[PDB]
Amino acid sequence: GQLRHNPLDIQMLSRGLHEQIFGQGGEMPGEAAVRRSVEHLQKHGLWGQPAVPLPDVELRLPPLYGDNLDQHFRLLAQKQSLPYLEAANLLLQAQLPPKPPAWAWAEGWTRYGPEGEAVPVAIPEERALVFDVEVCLAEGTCPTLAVAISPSAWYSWCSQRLVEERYSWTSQLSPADLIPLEQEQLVVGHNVSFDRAHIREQYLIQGSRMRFLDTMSMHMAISGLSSFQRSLWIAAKQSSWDWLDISSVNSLAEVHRLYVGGPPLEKEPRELFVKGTMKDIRENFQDLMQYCAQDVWATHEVFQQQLPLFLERCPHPVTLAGMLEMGVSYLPVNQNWERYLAEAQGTYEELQREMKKSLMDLANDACQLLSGERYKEDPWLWDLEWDLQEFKQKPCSEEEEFQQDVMARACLQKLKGTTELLPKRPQHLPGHPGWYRKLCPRLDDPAWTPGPSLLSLQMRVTPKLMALTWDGFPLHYSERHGWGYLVPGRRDSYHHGNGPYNDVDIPGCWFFKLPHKDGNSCNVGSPFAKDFLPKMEDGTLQAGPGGASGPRALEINKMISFWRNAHKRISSQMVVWLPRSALPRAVIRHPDYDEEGLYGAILPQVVTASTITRRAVEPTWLTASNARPDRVGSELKAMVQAPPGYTLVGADVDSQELWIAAVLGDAHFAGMHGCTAFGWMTLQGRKSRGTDLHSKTATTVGISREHAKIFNYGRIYGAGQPFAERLLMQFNHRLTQQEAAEKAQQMYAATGGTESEMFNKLESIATSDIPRTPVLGCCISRALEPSAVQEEFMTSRVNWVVQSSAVDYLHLMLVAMKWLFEEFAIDGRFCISIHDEVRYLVREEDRYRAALALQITNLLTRCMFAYKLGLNDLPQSVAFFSAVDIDRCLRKEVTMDCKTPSNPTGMERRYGIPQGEALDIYQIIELTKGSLEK
Amino acid sequence: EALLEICQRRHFLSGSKQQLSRDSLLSGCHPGFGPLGVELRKNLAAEWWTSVVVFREQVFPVDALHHKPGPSGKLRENLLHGALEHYVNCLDLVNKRLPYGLAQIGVCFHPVKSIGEKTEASLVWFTPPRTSNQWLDFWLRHRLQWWRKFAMSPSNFSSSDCQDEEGRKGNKLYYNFPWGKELIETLWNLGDHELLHMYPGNVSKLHGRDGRKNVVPCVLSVNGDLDRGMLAYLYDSFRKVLKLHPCLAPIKVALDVGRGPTLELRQVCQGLFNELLENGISVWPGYLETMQSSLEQLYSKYDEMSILFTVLVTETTLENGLIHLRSRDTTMKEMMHISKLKDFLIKYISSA
Amino acid sequence: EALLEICQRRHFLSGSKQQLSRDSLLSGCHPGFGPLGVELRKNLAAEWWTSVVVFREQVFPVDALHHKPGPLSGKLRENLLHGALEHYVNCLDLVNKRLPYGLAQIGVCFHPVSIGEKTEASLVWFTPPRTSNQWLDFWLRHRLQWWRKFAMSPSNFSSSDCQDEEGRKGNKLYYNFPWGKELIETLWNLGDHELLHMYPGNVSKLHGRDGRKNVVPCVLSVNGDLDRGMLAYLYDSFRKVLKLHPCLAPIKVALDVGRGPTLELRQVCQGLFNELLENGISVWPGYLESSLEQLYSKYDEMSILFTVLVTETTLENGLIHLRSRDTTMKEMMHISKLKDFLIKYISSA
DNA sequence: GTCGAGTCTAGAGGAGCC
DNA sequence: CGGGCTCCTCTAGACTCGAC
Ligand SMILES: Nc1ccn([C@H]2C[C@H](O)[C@@H](COP(=O)(O)OP(=O)(O)OP(=O)(O)O)O2)c(=O)n1
Ligand SMILES: O=C(Nc1ccn(-c2ccccc2)n1)N[C@H]1CCOc2c(Cl)cccc21
Ligand SMILES: [Ca+2]
């Protein structure tokens, strides 16, 4: 039969799949290992529990190359990453003639031969290049000038916007507006995603073979720093400290200093591309172009120094092939993007005004406490600045009516000419108290508005104006301690909380800090945080005006908090709208084609490995919020909509780090699966039935599964019991302090224990002389090795094993997906890879083939993880993807309609975006007949 | 009750307490508005026009007769019929491209039998059937935002979804008066029923271009009550003050005069009066008052009238051009040179 | 006939071409006004309001209703005088019992022809009897000047003196239409008859301060037809061209485009359109869509002041073709200088 | 030449993601 | 001892430049 079991009764892979993947002739665990496993499981009360047999899966997988799975992965990655290593070698071997003495003021691409001469060319026509692109920020996002380094000649590029001055330029960019380039081609740069974002041919829907290498990514791969380490490094540049001399920050100057060394690099103090105008660039063309050439030369030197070190400390071809495929992200968009920006900004402005009206009214009403010195009896506003300035100085007939009008106008005009004694800059509201003037915008301000408009909830006078109160005591701000409240009664306490402070010393009252969500060590910045909404509902935090003023203030703050912090990021996204000729025939011929609708693409500015764990970073898309009922502009990802004839076929890995930690601990205990209590708990479950670890935690404590994620992952990586107690009290306000502590004990009682073996294995990898990834064998940054930091930064290094293993998981998934898509001719391409979620822009006709490829990829990756750990087997519980989402827009669930304050009609009504579908393995097999061919 | 006393005392409302019952105001059986009430209503109509007709390429004004003769005549209860009577002729302006609207502010006569006159603002939006719900939602949001952008308490304006006896979709705006909610605006997604009834025969006459397709437009009708909305803003505005919006306060500035010399200060005040009037700013000439009262009494009077600024031209203006400006919102006084008054007053209002 | 055809075709007067009637226009039985006619009448009402109410401290608006509740079964109002007289007493508190003081209103008047509606601007002036004739001549001169101000041929705006049945003095303003002279305004010195009729007994409420003595005023009635004013100005302002005064012409600027690119030119035109609208200049968005001659003829028939054309050249240097309706001449001027030019031109009109 | 109003910088606390 | 990132607004302080 196709059903298999292990000596611990965990159902393993199907017989056919296990035969094709692991081959035959394995080694049994043996008697002693099984006895230890059984004793451990029985002591922890898990042995003998039956589980529902998941159906056996039969697949004729594509013919794997080599003699085992690791050789298969190596051969795939080498074939994928062979020409680009050749291009990098071409970059490493050859040198360059000296930079031209005088650049060229011309449009297009010019080739600099020896002695600085320039020759007009169409494209550089090089397999390998080093790229740096400069953009005039004030003008817009169009590229201004660039320099390309080639093993044979220098290259310079200038846009027609710099060469030619016009009254107006298009604010919506086009492929013809970008830098022309591009069988394989490699382009290197310090932050190459920015340079890639300005290439004309990168915005085509169909993919291109050009790839991009980043020196920040390789810097973090070889010798990076943590955020705390970066802070300490910058503090030092202005117990262990040997890591300082072997690491640097991702600034090109510091990277060049660390890897090449020499005279420090210089940057133009005028900042003619950031703070300057186009005329400054035209006048300062030679200096700016020379600085560009200097930067590209420094990048070339750093790349030459970095490539061998990276290929040594990261020897597996899979890592490089994944980093190559991780920087070709692509996000398709349309006119709904512009509509979304407009609607989000309008809703934000409406809510902002609505919030500011109440604050302006309260401020205006309080100005009357100036009279009679009544402000010193106000419990809230007795501390502000109430001082006043002074003003500073250095029937008549038609003929009779006309004469009277002329005399009146002349008399008025004579007085209007007395400005000689008048200072030129008008004094700001001299007669209004200072606290008022500060809130009132100055007249010259381009965007001026009447009233104390500069007022917001984040300021330090808003709680005093709104007369906010905590349990009947007025709020009060202390610089040393943040926000608090004054409890009257000092006779120079009947209240308990963050305790009396003798530091503040407000006569006749004690001072108590507001209880912060992260303990008595932290300070509260504003009483309008999300944590204080339950306290207002409970009546502890009250507003003086009463009614719904406080609740409405906090609700508006919650609604507009994300857009306030992300509208610069989102509105500034570079969108290149393809014309009709650039689009494929499939999109044009599709029924859902909109002739009056724009179609474009956003290329995320992704740094492939910008983490000590080699996780990618992106300011907008990897921080992009999901659609929520009460968040302005939270439908951001839902605006990433596949073109007509295309769908987004993607999936998210299920319980990734839990499984990686469990499999490590199991391979540490005995060479099988489910050896430990933690691995057995992880394996025995199903996300469809709500019996996975996150769901089980979300049931055992009244927190949600999303919060259970944080709870479990904090428990793994060093969160003590007080942290768990704070999280429980935060996510479940019904829990008291004593009740929250009890559940913290319950979840941390058995941690000889349930999670002992994984802890031991992680400490073993961390304390090793050269810590390396257990699967792909990639070494830790040189600034975290025991020879550098010794025992310090332990939590970072222990979490590094699992997180870098997850990055290896992503690399394996990308390589396998590329192989499967190339082998069977699946018309699709990589869309975006958040940390553990991979999205693929696939054509409509091949969504189910893409789903089958994704499931096969996940199966093969889990088998590779098991093989590298010596287990030589994979359970059926974690074999495949629970649900592969086939959708047109980009959202976590295919069912949500994404109703937000900016989009209250939902995605189905406002736009033509139907709901998608989430499919398991069996549905995919039935749909595609178990084959990836056409 | 205090608000109605102020409104009748400051000539927002006419009559006595007999005809000032809230039922009389809501019905339309009250006597005419006072001059300040007329000015507040006219500013409300101007703002409505600016928001609906001015900054819209597809909207044109329309003229509908107060009576509809033929089968003895009758007065009009709604502006929708007259607007639909102009659909074919106003198709020519937009080159038969939808959406396009017709707008009108007028008085409609309601049976209360007595007749209660209501001033109503109406917009008739001809939209293709495909996007009718989208345009209904857009206009609901736009109108609710318009009502809320002049309100000291925008939460008192609400929208409720509703359905007709034929199942046609629509929305109803409201203002929460102290006693309860009263309807101030209504939107209805009427189909082609009224258009087809009013234009029987060939339907190619009614075809409008939905992009590249000809289609009969669904009639989205928006109808708002300017009298009840004016009373809503009066209640929202209401130390006794009427914090009406700077764009809605009937009189923007009040001009006064200080101590002697009287003759020269009168000339200065008259010149400033002419300047502010030529610059589109309504002025209350308090320098003409003979029964002079104290500064506090004038301040209370101006506050009840919703006077944004009080200009006090004194003898010191004759020597250095300095005038004293008091603001309702802050009750604080400031001195600004006489040359910069028109600029600011135009800036303060336009930026509101 | 040709003028009425142009008005119907260019959306000044609504209805069918044959539905157009001189007598229906003169009596108020016409179906209504097209958008351009509505804007022209609104401009005329604004000019009248600025002339009378805004620039004076004694003239105030009133809100007389359209109906007359109570026994004489109410009826439609026939004149705006009665509402002003009803407002006379309680509005004396506005002027602190000072005389003279006036009430003005532009409303809808219903007269028995069918039923005709005439939009009429009326001013009711309360005068101590000594200076009634002086104020009557003052208002006669000012109103005739206001009517003549916008006219291309202010000789056609005539004035005449008459007396009513009781013999009270009163003038009558007129306009000389092509068929003949038609009444556009009328002044009468009615006296205290109506005031005493509507306020029997207790003359203390009717008194007013005139040099520290109490006086019952004499009403001066100044009543003019704005619809007839609109017709008079259309006839006075007429190559097919409608040379309306800039303070009256409904749409001032026509904004168009040339050849491609369509998107960038449309963006420039939208920016210009919004900039002009932000400063009170009415525009015709003709860029949302023929030969230049046809567009210019259409704009001339619509009383368009200036025509602006945005072409490919505008992107390179900002020059826009500018055309004047009064003088058939074309000039090129920069975009940023167009708004100030239009504002100046309207102010200098 | 002396002081008061713009400008840049840095830190602190909040808020998005996996 | 949660870990890894990202960016924002508000405020205090040092500095710079202009008007009297
Ligand atoms: N607060 C968090 C969130 C995430 N992670 C890490 C651990 C996860 O393995 C990885 C991906 O996070 P997910 O939220 O996707 O967690 P899972 O993929 O395990 O959950 P699911 O089964 O819902 O996909 O990020 C973490 O350490 N702490
Ligand atoms: O809303 C505003 N905005 C601003 C912003 C700067 N301003 C200014 C104006 C002149 C000289 C200095 C400064 N004014 N100011 C109101 C609020 C206080 O009260 C008044 C008064 Cl008494 C008169 C006029 C305006 C106001
Ligand atoms: Ca996941």
Numbering used by the authors:
A (entry chain A): 67 to 248, 262 to 317, 343 to 498, 532 to 629, 731 to 989, 1051 to 1233
B (entry chain B): 67 to 137, 178 to 218, 229 to 354, 369 to 482
C (entry chain C): 67 to 138, 178 to 218, 230 to 354, 369 to 419, 423 to 482
From the paper:
Mammalian mitochondrial DNA (mtDNA) is replicated by DNA polymerase γ (POLγ), a heterotrimeric complex consisting of a catalytic POLγA subunit and two accessory POLγB subunits. In addition to its C-terminal DNA polymerase domain, POLγA also contains an N-terminal 3′–5′ exonuclease domain that is crucial for proofreading during mtDNA synthesis. More than 300 mutations in POLG, the gene encoding the catalytic subunit, have been linked to severe, progressive conditions with high rates of morbidity and mortality, for which no treatment exists. Here we report on the discovery and characterization of PZL-A, a first-in-class small-molecule activator of mtDNA synthesis that is capable of restoring function to the most common mutant variants of POLγ.
In the presence of PZL-A, we identified a novel density between the POLγA subunit and the proximal POLγB subunit. The size and shape of this density enabled unambiguous placement of PZL-A. PZL-A adopts a C-shaped orientation owing to a stabilizing intramolecular hydrogen bond (2.7–2.8 Å) between the urea and the adjacent pyrazole ring. Furthermore, the urea carbonyl group forms a hydrogen bond (approximately 2.7 Å) with the backbone amine of G588 in POLγA. Further structural analysis revealed that the PZL-A-binding pocket is predominantly hydrophobic, with the exception of a small hydrophilic patch near the polar urea carbonyl group and the chromane oxygen of PZL-A. We identified three residues—L566, H569 and W585—that are in close proximity to PZL-A. The two hydrophobic residues, L566 and W585, support PZL-A binding by flanking the compound on either side, whereas H569 stabilizes the chromane group by contributing to the hydrophilic patch. Even though the A467T mutation is positioned only around 9 Å from the compound binding site, the structures of A467T-PZL-A and G848S-PZL-A are almost identical to the apo structures, including wild-type POLγ, with only minor effects on the architecture of the binding pocket or the mutated sites. Binding of PZL-A increases the stability of POLγ bound to template DNA, evidenced by a reduction in Kd and koff, and enhances the kcat of the enzyme.
